[model samples]
Target: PSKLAVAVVDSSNMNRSMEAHNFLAKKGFNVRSYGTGERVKLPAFDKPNVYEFGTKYEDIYRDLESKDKEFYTQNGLLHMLDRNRRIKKCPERFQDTKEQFDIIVTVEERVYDLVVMHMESMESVDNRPVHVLNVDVVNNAEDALMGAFVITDMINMMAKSTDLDNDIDELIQEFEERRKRVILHSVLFY
Candidate 1:
């Protein structure tokens, strides 16, 4: 079969989503990271930003350096910025992408809702065969790290499915049944 296309979504697009983005990309999946907000925001500790979708990570890294290098680093922004730089591009807004993903993994419930709602308005995803999975991970390095593992593992399992609808139902059931392995909450599908 052809490689699966995936998108990892989060609200801020700073940490969680980017973590999964780096992981899945490294694991050979065709993937991207997106923010559900109007504009992508950085890991602001004592300041804020509204960078565009295609903004380079170097720019964001520089911005954090200007705002307060010591603070952003102390608060773990440097680590995330490093990972962000490694990806092919910077954070993108979900609204900007017109491409279809075989699987869209969201890091929060509202992020899932935002993507699904956008899909409902822009494309008939219900008519097309797509899987939108919600895997909520705590906004921390350890949690995001674990969440990335779970996301990768889940995708690996999901790759085995030849039956889209039935496999998605079974996948969601399997995630719930194996809840202890997850870092935080439930994994849902649309």
Candidate 2:
């Protein structure tokens, strides 16, 4: 298949979703990410509202580091920031998205809810094709690392399958069940 466009959603756009976004992009897929929460925050920063929609990772890093350079270093904020800066340059809010996707993946169930609700509402006005899947990945770096692997594997599976031209509903249903019986089932034990 041609390059597949994807969207990854999570609560804060910090770890789980962002890493997925970055990881798949490296694999050559066109991917974007968004946070479902009211606002973004740097966990190691102790600051509740540091990242904003469309804010670049560099800015978030600088803000957090400015607050406490030692703390930022101790918490490995620079490394995360650098990784994020390469992920997509900046983070976006799901509500502000005007792009289309072949698939929308959420790292957690709540994020799945948020993306589905928001996409349903958007569908009222925009005629965009959407396929959202939830992997039930916990919010953490370790979970994201594993989730990224599974997510990429799933995409590859979908791409290699003959269902690419089939009905979207059937395709999505098939993949969702596969996700449940396979990756999610195995990961839940961790």
How many residue pairs collide in each prediction? 0, 0
Top candidate when judged by lDDT against the true structure: 1
Q: What is the lDDT of every predicted structure here?
A: 0.75, 0.70
After superposition, candidate 1 runs with Cα above 4 Å error: 43-50, 123-127, 180-190
Cα lDDT of model 1 by residue, 1-190, tens digit: 3378888889877788888887777778888888898877654268666677778888888887997789878878787788778775567788777777778888877787887777766635345556778888887778988888888888777777876556677676777678654323233223
User: What TM-score would each prediction reach against the true structure?
Assistant: 0.83, 0.80
**Candidate 2 residue-wise lDDT, 1-190, digit = tens:** 4567777888877787777777678778778888887777766246454566777888888787777789668766577778888766777787776677777778877677777666656425444455666777766667778888888777777666565536544655677776663222111100
Position 63, candidate 2: lDDT:
83
Checking candidate 2 for backbone clashes, the offending pairs are: none
Candidate 2 structure lDDT: 0.70
Taking every candidate in turn, the Cα RMSD to the unseen true structure, in Å, is 3.6, 5.7
lDDT of 1 at 129: 58
